């Protein structure tokens, strides 16, 4: 009744505590994604530990432009993730092409390939604005399993 309701929040507290990102070296957004590891604006053991390998991680951050050559590649990586998974599409390329969009190769918005939970709009995604991409992620995890 009360113990059951608090135990579900305790499991959700583990995702609120720590989430491991994926080092998607996809574009210029990946350089600012490296700035999350940079000391001045840090999530290093604040709630983020870089390790790579899609099998171990909990959150994958799509960091830039995706093309038709990359659409089969990213899709199965998301499938290689453990079932409690979150996708953060960071940048205008990740939201529907920086420019592009009306281009031949670029797939529009990532959502055509892989579903996204948290959007970051910033081209040069400022590390200040990037910090929401992990903090809002933890805030969005509220309730899991009622019955």
């Amino acid at each position: 009744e009360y113990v059951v309701a608090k135990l579900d929040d305790l499991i959700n507290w583990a995702r609120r505590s720590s989430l491991w990102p994926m080092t998607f070296g996809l574009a210029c957004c990946a350089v600012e994604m490296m700035h999350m590891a940079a000391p001045r604006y840090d999530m290093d053991r604040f709630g983020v530990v870089f390790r790579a390998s899609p099998r171990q991680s909990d959150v994958m951050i799509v960091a830039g432009t995706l093309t038709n050559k990359m659409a089969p590649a990213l899709r199965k990586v998301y499938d290689q993730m453990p079932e409690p998974r979150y996708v953060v599409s960071m940048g205008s390329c990740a939201n529907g092409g920086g420019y592009y969009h009306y281009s031949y190769s670029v797939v529009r918005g990532c959502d055509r390939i892989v579903p996204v939970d948290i959007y970051v709009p910033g081209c040069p995604p400022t590390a200040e604005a990037l910090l929401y991409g992990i903090l809002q992620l933890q805030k969005k995890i509220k309730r899991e399993k009622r019955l």
Binding site: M22, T23, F24, G25, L26, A52, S53, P54, M70, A73, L74, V77
Partner: protein, 54 residues
């Protein structure tokens, strides 16, 4: 006198010939031809696409 026709019977094969099996070939004079053929042993890798840390 003995000729080449009698010498061909004593050639490298099976001495007495016949038998159920005659798949064996005379040995090469200075060991076998290189079995350079078969098995490329080329290992293919998909190292790139996304996140190789490199």
């Amino acid at each position: 006198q003995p000729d080449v026709e009698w010498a061909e019977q004593y050639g490298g094969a099976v001495m007495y010939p016949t038998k159920e099996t005659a798949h064996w070939k005379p040995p090469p004079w200075n060991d076998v031809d290189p079995p350079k053929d078969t098995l490329v042993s080329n290992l293919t890798l998909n190292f790139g696409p996304q996140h190789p840390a490199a």
